[PDB]
Amino acid sequence: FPSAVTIKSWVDKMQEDLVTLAKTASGVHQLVDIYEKYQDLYTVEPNNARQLVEIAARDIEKLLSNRSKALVRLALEAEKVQAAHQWREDFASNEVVYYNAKDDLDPEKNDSEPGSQRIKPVFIDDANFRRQVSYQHAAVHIPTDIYEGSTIVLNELNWTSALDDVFKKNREEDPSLLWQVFGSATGLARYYPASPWVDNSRTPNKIDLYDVRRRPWYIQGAASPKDMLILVDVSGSVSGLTLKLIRTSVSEMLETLSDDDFVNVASFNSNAQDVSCFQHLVQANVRNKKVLKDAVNNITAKGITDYKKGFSFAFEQLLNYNVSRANCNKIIMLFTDGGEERAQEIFAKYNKDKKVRVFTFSVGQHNYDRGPIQWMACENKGYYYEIPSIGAIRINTQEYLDVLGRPMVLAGDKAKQVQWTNVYLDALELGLVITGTLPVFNITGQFENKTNLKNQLILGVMGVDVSLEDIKRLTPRFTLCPNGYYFAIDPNGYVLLHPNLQPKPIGVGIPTINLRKRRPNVQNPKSQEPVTLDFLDAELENDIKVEIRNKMIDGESGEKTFRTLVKSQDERYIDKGNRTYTWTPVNGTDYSLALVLPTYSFYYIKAKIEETITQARYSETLKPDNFEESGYTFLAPRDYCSDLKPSDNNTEFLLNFNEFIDRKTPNNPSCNTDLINRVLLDAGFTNELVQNYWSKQKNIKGVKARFVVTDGGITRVYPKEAGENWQENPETYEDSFYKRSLDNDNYVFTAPYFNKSGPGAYESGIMVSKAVEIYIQGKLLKPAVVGIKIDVNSWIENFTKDCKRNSDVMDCVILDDGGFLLMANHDDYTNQIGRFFGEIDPSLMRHLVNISVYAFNKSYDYQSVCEPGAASKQSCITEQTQYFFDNDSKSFSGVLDCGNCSRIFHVEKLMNTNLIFIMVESKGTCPCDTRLLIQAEQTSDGPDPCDMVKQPRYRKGPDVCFDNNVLEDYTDC
Amino acid sequence: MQLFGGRYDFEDTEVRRSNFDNFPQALISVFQVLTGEDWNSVMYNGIM
Ligand SMILES: *[C@@H]1O[C@H](CO)[C@@H](O[C@@H]2O[C@H](CO)[C@@H](O)[C@H](O[C@@H]3O[C@H](CO)[C@@H](O)[C@H](O)[C@H]3NC(C)=O)[C@H]2NC(C)=O)[C@H](O)[C@H]1NC(C)=O
Ligand SMILES: *[C@@H]1O[C@H](CO)[C@@H](O[C@@H]2O[C@H](CO)[C@@H](O[C@@H]3O[C@H](CO)[C@@H](O)[C@H](O)[C@@H]3O)[C@H](O)[C@H]2NC(C)=O)[C@H](O)[C@H]1NC(C)=O
Ligand SMILES: *[C@@H]1O[C@H](CO)[C@@H](O[C@@H]2O[C@H](CO)[C@@H](O[C@@H]3O[C@H](CO)[C@@H](O)[C@H](O)[C@@H]3O)[C@H](O)[C@H]2NC(C)=O)[C@H](O)[C@H]1NC(C)=O
Ligand SMILES: *[C@@H]1O[C@H](CO)[C@@H](O[C@@H]2O[C@H](CO)[C@@H](O)[C@H](O)[C@H]2NC(C)=O)[C@H](O)[C@H]1NC(C)=O
Ligand SMILES: *[C@@H]1O[C@H](CO)[C@@H](O[C@@H]2O[C@H](CO)[C@@H](O)[C@H](O)[C@H]2NC(C)=O)[C@H](O)[C@H]1NC(C)=O
Ligand SMILES: *[C@@H]1O[C@H](CO)[C@@H](O)[C@H](O)[C@H]1NC(C)=O
Ligand SMILES: *[C@@H]1O[C@H](CO)[C@@H](O)[C@H](O)[C@H]1NC(C)=O
Ligand SMILES: *[C@@H]1O[C@H](CO)[C@@H](O)[C@H](O)[C@H]1NC(C)=O
Ligand SMILES: [Ca+2]
Ligand SMILES: [Ca+2]
């Protein structure tokens, strides 16, 4: 085994060889030279990240105040309009004309139900809606089990028809506005503009079971947040059909709950245990509810019924005050069949003043006495609900919000506050969106205070979407580098706006569906959960980020600079990036907005080119017939002008881009000058490289392909044969290697993938990249990332000439940080190239981490898909490992032993690059396995919830809670 | 009422109305099996 100085001297002649090959062939110092040679085609402006945040915080203020004004007027009209409605019952005499969504639009149908008359609308196709729509009226959604033509429903479509004039007045004023909808108390919803619903009832074989009342946006503006507590009666009498019904009501009751709502679930049979692991009221987020809905299911009925120990346990649960709580409506609901005891004594003290509200549910078909339960409900200002059937569950476990809304409708105007929802997928397929809601109240005869019998309910709730693609147009990231971004946050820790946030719903648990019990054609529910990713789950968690995260939940302003490690774009690397954060509150709302920058991004380039010939000359550089002397040029699909659209077929896009500058001068009076201009300047900078430097050295021996991925989207792979293999995203702010090249001050090597499809190994090769780094007036700039795809065959020859090709004495390999295998001596390893090195000899890799040579961090990706397990895709959690050098020390000697054998490995790290060289004795001499240490998205179901909630994350609830008005009717059950 | 009272605590959504829960009901059930009509259903439920 060679000495430590021989490995030292032999690494230094093959890290000097790779870097000279990459410093020379790519042209780092040449592209630095021509950014500095000009100085005057551009100027260098600063990103004032105090100022940028303040500017952004105000476009989201004004956007969400403009939405709010529209909401207020609609509400006023609805209140005024229905106070002048006459309650007619002759509807076959005077037809109600409306367009009904989810109905066949074929003219020849002509069903013509009594009372109603439909509309055939004309349906232009649209952008900002990715569906055909009509701007002349509002559609109407009736849920499926609700009959339309009922006097109760027919009378909504009469009075609600005056909203189409106010609907129209909102979009005339603001073209950008998205869905406008009124969700009725009656269960009928009207939205503008009209479009056909996505599931028709019976024209396909999937049938929608969508109810407006059920909806989260409808619920948050229906009522105030609430600490509920479900009691379940588990006595012996319940076992049977009735027990079956209860498990489906509680799961149903929960759907109703929200993050702001706290909830626990207890159960009694002569003792009250608590159904799961929790013991206090927990946040009823997606996860906690998933635990409770998984413990409600396993319940077995046995034993004597005791309503006294069931309501003692409930009240005690209600009084914890140590835990984090909603502290608003306090209510307890019991599911039971029949009661012989009213438990008068427990209610006298625990709730002598009736602070708590009791709702009693009688379920199943049975003969047990219901008088005592009704009495309990009446005594406590709750309500009573029967459920005999499965189809009766859905409208009675949502109906309690008519009771809880009462002291809000007695609060008057004070209760008309806009609230904005958690991001969620739109019913109509719009994408991620948030809705601002306002409740409409039933005011009839207010002038004189004549009735009030049913004047304590809301007419319904009114909402208006903001799409998250509308907010991302108020937070522009182009001046800032790929590293910089804006993050938005609730007072709940959830992230409103984040690079990491994705359309797929956030998943819980490992998905298990039983194929042996899905009959083929019945169509179960798909999903309704909100997409609540948290800030400490969108990014790698620190302790110096939980400080930042708490500090901008409680509405403060500030900046912070620290060293933290960024997870890479692809999930394979972790790079220590020195960042600065800066946050401020959006003053109209409860959102607070932040901005990450990396020091060195504090300055950007603005293009200062305006000459006729110079913008002209740089623009034919990106012509696809002129790639024989330029290099297969790419171009990023920014929204350059409003007219040319991002196309995802890039040769399509670059023609429509470059047609645009010929057919019209780049002045373009409805199009931003700087973004297009910077691109033009850039293409004259990645031209002078490809003309005056790369086309001189037309073939370097080991060099396969040469790229300049730059800022302005223009990536230039140098031979067109090589550009067929360029499998990157052509958007330069989505490339992984672009972003890892900017963090590092040394050449970076990217490992090719293992297996997969497409040619990514011998054909393209392993790639090196390096950020360009210029100084203008003593101000750092990193405009572009040069690079090289390496030839893996040639590199091997230099490497071969104490390691032979195929040696049995000892094997040596080169590994980039992250532990991936790039170059291998054996030839059974270099076939499996770009593979995680702990999968080809897991014994050595395990030891290396122990020596402190390597470090890692497992994280959770709450938005990913996986195949089900037997117990096409669902959402699930994956755990993800990344590996990264944590020790700066250059060399590491030692020996590892498996038991009865030693192997002496020597590790040396090449200077000036992330690569590491290790020499070790052949694996075959000691037959050892430990277990195969693998690095992949690995399906898992963590972290366990029962341990998170003992020390929950900081949170801030709603300031205004409406409950317990003294003059509430409290007489109807 | 001893052997079958309670005891029809099945978790099906169907009705077995000729059951032995009360005394009036048990009496009605006993009589139906004497008229012979559909007594096999009343026996199948007692085995399940
Ligand atoms: C493997 O090792 C070889 C030899 O060191 C290395 O070589 C290429 O080697 C030749 C041998 O002299 C170099 O001349 C050649 O470099 C160029 O010519 C002169 C030499 O001083 C200088 O201008 C630069 O070194 C460089 N510039 C040129 C010619 O444009 C050198 N480079 C190539 C690729 O031909 C291989 O690169 C090593 N294997 C790799 C690529 O890792
Ligand atoms: C709910 O539906 C009823 C029935 O369609 C609507 O009442 C109708 O309202 C219109 C305009 O308010 C009435 O038109 C007026 O007719 C009189 C003659 O009757 C004429 O002198 C006026 O110049 C005008 O043309 C219509 O007659 C009336 N129908 C009845 C039976 O009274 C009502 O408008 C709908 N509510 C909403 C909010 O849309
Ligand atoms: C808003 O509140 C008002 C009352 O404050 C509600 O109006 C009431 O609606 C009921 C519906 O059951 C009407 O009662 C019906 O009367 C007819 C006679 O026309 C009778 O045939 C029915 O059997 C039933 O008793 C009642 O007339 C009406 N009250 C008033 C004062 O107009 C209204 O329904 C609420 N708004 C919404 C959208 O529900
Ligand atoms: C958000 O609103 C606050 C006030 O509630 C603004 O703070 C003020 O800032 C101005 C100068 O910008 C000072 O003159 C005032 O004294 C500040 N307010 C108070 C009460 O001291 C803040 O600038 C606003 N920020 C944004 C982004 O809109
Ligand atoms: C992420 O990895 C880093 C390794 O660099 C961890 O940081 C070290 O954590 C240990 C305890 O696990 C401390 O003793 C060291 O002082 C830390 N070193 C540095 C440089 O921070 C970090 O804990 C990991 N994060 C997680 C969540 O495991
Ligand atoms: C807000 O409304 C005003 C007035 O219609 C308009 O000028 C402005 O552009 C709107 N802002 C946003 C972000 O929609
Ligand atoms: C982080 O900050 C220190 C001190 O300002 C600086 O020396 C270091 O270069 C920064 N980190 C990186 C990766 O540049
Ligand atoms: C290093 O390995 C030793 C022996 O296997 C072990 O006791 C120790 O915990 C390891 N160090 C770390 C950091 O895990
Ligand atoms: Ca009972
Ligand atoms: Ca018969």
Side-chain angles (χ1 to χ4, degrees), chain A residues 59 62-63 66-67 173-174 474:
Chain A
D59 293 336
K62 288 183 182 179
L63 180 67
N66 281 4
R67 222 94 300 186
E173 186 164 346
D174 187 350
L474 303 172

Short mmCIF file of all heavy atoms in Angstrom, two decimals, chain A residues 59 62-63 66-67 173-174 474, ligand 6:
data_model
loop_
_atom_site.label_atom_id
_atom_site.label_comp_id
_atom_site.label_asym_id
_atom_site.label_seq_id
_atom_site.Cartn_x
_atom_site.Cartn_y
_atom_site.Cartn_z
N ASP A 59 -47.52 45.85 -3.14
CA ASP A 59 -48.35 45.39 -4.23
C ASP A 59 -49.24 44.25 -3.77
O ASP A 59 -50.33 44.09 -4.30
CB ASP A 59 -47.52 44.95 -5.40
CG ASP A 59 -46.79 46.08 -6.03
OD1 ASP A 59 -47.25 47.22 -5.88
OD2 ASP A 59 -45.79 45.82 -6.72
N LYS A 62 -52.03 46.15 -1.98
CA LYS A 62 -52.99 46.77 -2.86
C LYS A 62 -53.78 45.75 -3.64
O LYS A 62 -54.93 46.01 -3.98
CB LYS A 62 -52.31 47.73 -3.81
CG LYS A 62 -51.82 48.95 -3.16
CD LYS A 62 -51.21 49.89 -4.15
CE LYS A 62 -50.69 51.12 -3.44
NZ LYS A 62 -50.06 52.08 -4.37
N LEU A 63 -53.16 44.63 -4.01
CA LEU A 63 -53.88 43.56 -4.68
C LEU A 63 -54.97 43.01 -3.80
O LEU A 63 -56.10 42.83 -4.23
CB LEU A 63 -52.95 42.43 -5.06
CG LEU A 63 -53.59 41.27 -5.77
CD1 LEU A 63 -54.04 41.76 -7.08
CD2 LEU A 63 -52.61 40.21 -5.96
N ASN A 66 -57.69 45.73 -3.20
CA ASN A 66 -58.55 45.80 -4.36
C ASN A 66 -59.51 44.63 -4.45
O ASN A 66 -60.58 44.76 -5.03
CB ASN A 66 -57.78 45.80 -5.66
CG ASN A 66 -57.20 47.10 -5.99
OD1 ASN A 66 -57.28 48.05 -5.22
ND2 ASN A 66 -56.74 47.21 -7.21
N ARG A 67 -59.11 43.46 -4.00
CA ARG A 67 -60.01 42.31 -4.04
C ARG A 67 -61.13 42.51 -3.02
O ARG A 67 -62.31 42.21 -3.24
CB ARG A 67 -59.24 41.03 -3.76
CG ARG A 67 -59.63 39.87 -4.66
CD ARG A 67 -58.72 39.75 -5.87
NE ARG A 67 -58.75 40.94 -6.72
CZ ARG A 67 -58.13 41.03 -7.89
NH1 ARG A 67 -57.44 40.00 -8.35
NH2 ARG A 67 -58.19 42.15 -8.59
N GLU A 173 -64.21 46.88 -13.99
CA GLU A 173 -63.24 47.70 -13.27
C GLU A 173 -61.86 47.04 -13.22
O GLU A 173 -60.84 47.71 -13.41
CB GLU A 173 -63.74 47.98 -11.86
CG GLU A 173 -62.87 48.94 -11.07
CD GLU A 173 -63.58 49.48 -9.86
OE1 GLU A 173 -64.81 49.33 -9.77
OE2 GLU A 173 -62.90 50.08 -8.99
N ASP A 174 -61.82 45.74 -12.96
CA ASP A 174 -60.56 45.02 -12.91
C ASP A 174 -60.59 43.81 -13.85
O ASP A 174 -61.26 42.81 -13.58
CB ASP A 174 -60.28 44.57 -11.48
CG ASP A 174 -58.90 43.96 -11.32
OD1 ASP A 174 -58.24 43.70 -12.35
OD2 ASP A 174 -58.49 43.73 -10.17
N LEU A 474 -45.97 40.20 -8.60
CA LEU A 474 -45.73 41.36 -7.77
C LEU A 474 -44.43 41.19 -7.04
O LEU A 474 -43.99 42.11 -6.34
CB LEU A 474 -46.86 41.49 -6.78
CG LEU A 474 -48.17 41.59 -7.51
CD1 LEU A 474 -49.16 41.51 -6.47
CD2 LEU A 474 -48.32 42.86 -8.26
C1 LIG C 6 -55.71 48.07 -7.73
O1 LIG C 6 -56.78 48.87 -8.27
C2 LIG C 6 -56.37 50.07 -8.93
C3 LIG C 6 -57.63 50.78 -9.36
O2 LIG C 6 -58.44 49.96 -10.20
C4 LIG C 6 -55.46 49.72 -10.10
O3 LIG C 6 -54.99 50.93 -10.70
C5 LIG C 6 -54.28 48.88 -9.62
O4 LIG C 6 -53.51 48.45 -10.73
C6 LIG C 6 -54.77 47.65 -8.86
N1 LIG C 6 -53.65 46.89 -8.34
C7 LIG C 6 -53.56 45.57 -8.46
C8 LIG C 6 -52.34 44.94 -7.87
O5 LIG C 6 -54.42 44.91 -9.02
#
